[PDB]
Amino acid sequence: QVQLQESGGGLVQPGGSLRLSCAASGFTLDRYAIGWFRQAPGKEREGVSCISSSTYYADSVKGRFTISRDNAKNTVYLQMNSLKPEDTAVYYCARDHGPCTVLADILYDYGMDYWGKGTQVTVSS
Amino acid sequence: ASTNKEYVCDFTDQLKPTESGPKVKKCEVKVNEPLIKVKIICPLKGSVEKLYDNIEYVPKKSPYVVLTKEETKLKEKLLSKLIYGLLISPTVNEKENNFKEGVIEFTLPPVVHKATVFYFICDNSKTEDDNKKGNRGIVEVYVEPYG
């Protein structure tokens, strides 16, 4: 019955904000690293951010996105400010038994499990 | 014409469940001369009771398949097409050359023209015992041009 549920997607204008939610059901997520990934349609999934039980940010979202974890709410959040059209994509969350692992500035995802169904993010003028 | 040098990465002890875990434990092999043999040792499930009961290996088909960077993705790729002429024996001390037997081995060729980096993971971070979590072992093989 383990589950990860993304929400918070929506449609905003450039410079707007959203907050994505990754809610754990049936386990406590503070024993796990939680990674945020995104996939524009037709393109390869890319790492966006990760929080372990430090933090990882893709260069393109540094200073605009903030990952955080609410232990009581059994949820990890991604606050996305100053959104740009390049940020449009389907955003996914997943859990890792290991630490946030970065190789050659890429978030390692082969340990990632229980991928949520994804939440759509669109930034358009 | 003959290999007389081998680099060995051996995680036999470092991936055991620990209270600080899971941690990344790294072994880097940097190669800049010809005909080097590389040997990677990782613990087996059941080698000790508990301790490795959920260990996993990435790529499962190592050493024939490796992790390597392609654009901004880490991809599983055939090693023999990344580096032409690499030698991989099907067996190692009469066992399959595969992490399910605890050891992988390969020998790099006489010439490499372009810097090439690839990785193997021996991942114990799903093994949990008594509040402790195993570690994620990463081997980075960094081959510089030579020959």
Numbering used by the authors:
A (entry chain B): 1 to 53, 57 to 128
B (entry chain A): 585 to 731
Extract from the study:
We determined crystal structures of anti-Pfs230 F5 and F10 nanobodies in complex with Pfs230 D1 to 1.7 and 2.1 Å resolution, respectively. As expected, the crystal structures show that F5 and F10 nanobodies bind to different sites on Pfs230 D1. The F5 nanobody faces one β-sheet of the Pfs230 D1 β-sandwich. For F5, it appears that CDR1 is not involved in contacting Pfs230 and several residues of CDR2 are not resolved in the structure. We focused our subsequent characterization on nanobodies F5 and F10, as they were the highest affinity binders from each of the epitope bins. Pfs230 and nanobody complex formation assays show that nanobody F5 is more efficient in dislodging the prodomain for binding to Pfs230 Pro-D1D2 than nanobody F10.
Pfs230 is one of the leading transmission-blocking malaria vaccine candidates in development. The 6-cys domain is a β-sandwich fold formed by two β-sheets of mixed parallel and antiparallel β-strands, with typically six disulfide-bonded cysteines that are positionally conserved.
